[PDB]
Amino acid sequence: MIVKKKLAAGEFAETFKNGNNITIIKAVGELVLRAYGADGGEGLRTIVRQGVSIKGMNYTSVMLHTEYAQEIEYWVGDLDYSFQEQTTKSRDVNSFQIPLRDGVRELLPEDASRNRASIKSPVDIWIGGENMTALNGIVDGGRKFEAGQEFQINTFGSVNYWVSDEEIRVFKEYSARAKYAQNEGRTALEANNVPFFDIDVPPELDGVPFSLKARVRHKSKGVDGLGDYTSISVKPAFYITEGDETTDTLIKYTSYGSTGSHSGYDFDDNTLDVMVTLSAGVHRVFPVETELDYDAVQEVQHDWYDESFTTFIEVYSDDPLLTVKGYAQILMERT
Ligand SMILES: [Ca+2]
Numbered sequence: 001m002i003v004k005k006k007l008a009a010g011e012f013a014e015t016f017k018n019g020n021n022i023t024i025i026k027a028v029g030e031l032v033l034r035a036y037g038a039d040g041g042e043g044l045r046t047i048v049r050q051g052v053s054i055k056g057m058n059y060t061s062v063m064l065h066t067e068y069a070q071e072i073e074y075w076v077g078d079l080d081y082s083f084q085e086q087t088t089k090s091r092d093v094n095s096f097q098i099p100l101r102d103g104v105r106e107l108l109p110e111d112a113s114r115n116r117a118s119i120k121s122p123v124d125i126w127i128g129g130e131n132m133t134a135l136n137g138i139v140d141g142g143r144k145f146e147a148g149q150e151f152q153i154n155t156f157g158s159v160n161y162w163v164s165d166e167e168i169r170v171f172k173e174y175s176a177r178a179k180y181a182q183n184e185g186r187t188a189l190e191a192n193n194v195p196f197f198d199i200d201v202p203p204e205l206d207g208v209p210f211s212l213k214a215r216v217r218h219k220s221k222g223v224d225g226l227g228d229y230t231s232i233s234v235k236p237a238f239y240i241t242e243g244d245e246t247t248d249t250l251i252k253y254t255s256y257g258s259t260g261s262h263s264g265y266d267f268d269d270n271t272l273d274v275m276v277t278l279s280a281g282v283h284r285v286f287p288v289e290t291e292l293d294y295d296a297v298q299e300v301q302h303d304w305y306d307e308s309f310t311t312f313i314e315v316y317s318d319d320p321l322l323t324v325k326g327y328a329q330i331l332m333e334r335t
Contacts (some may be wrong), residue, residue: 097330224302231261
């Protein structure tokens with residue numbers, strides 16, 4: 001029978017009417033400093049201060065003497081034969097990479113076979129048990145391990161991690177109006193100060209299509225003194241090198257065109273959304289306005305490479321290969 005023993009201050013007397021576990025091995029638990037006794041016909045004493053395996057005697061009631069009032073509860077499981085032995089040894093090693101993503105997520109599952117994990121994160125990582133939370137980017141019930149720090153976990157239970165609260169990944173945010181640009185090649189766009197950013201396409205993404213997006217704001221009313229009811233046609237694009245940064249040829253990617261008098265309210269922003277398929281390596285991307293509207297030329301003397309009525313508020317991305325914060329290295333040992 002598995003039975004409780006709690007504390008408070010004075011003597012305790014738990015007298016359950018059946019010593020079936022008399023001639024029996026006691027798996028008694030013990031804290032700090034106590035004294036106990038055996039009552040089964042005779043009144044006996046006992047003093048013991050460490051978890052011990054006891055032999056059999058007669059028992060109708062248990063005596064519980066107290067020196068320290070503030071020790072902790074135990075379960076003195078008395079059983080006919082009680083033997084518990086097993087630590088291992090680990091036979092197998094398995095090495096792999098985890099997908100570090102956003103919010104508190106499980107790093108390792110409960111797995112009775114795991115002995116040991118040696119882990120290295122390429123980013124600062126917070127590690128904890130089932131209590132760990134990160135309401136608002138602030139981790140509670142966790143502790144930090146540093147980027148590049150090798151550490152070990154030797155449990156077989158859940159562990160959790162946190163690295164970031166970002167659902168997707170962000171290339172650029174611009175406040176400057178995008179320039180009008182024809183597809184004149186990489187050298188010409190750079191020479192005329194058209195802002196760009198690079199995407200480093202990993203081997204794991206070599207020729208794999210992915211979504212590239214932008215939050216795009218068109219605003220024409222009163223801009224550079226343009227008439228409030230003048231109709232401006234827009235067609236934002238990414239011009240992307242088909243080879244790498246040192247190649248000149250650009251590919252134009254588009255998803256929508258729009259026409260009207262643009263007031264540029266933040267809630268009215270458009271989304272440029274294209275699939276792009278690129279070879280491994282670095283590709284250069286020029287967010288541009290491709291349409292030079294007749295009315296802009298006449299009224300406000302707009303020309304190629306001038307600032308348009310188009311702004312790339314945010315350029316970002318949602319491909320699972322890029323939304324990952326990178327890639328924890330795991331060596332796992334199991335029985
Ligand atoms: Ca027009």
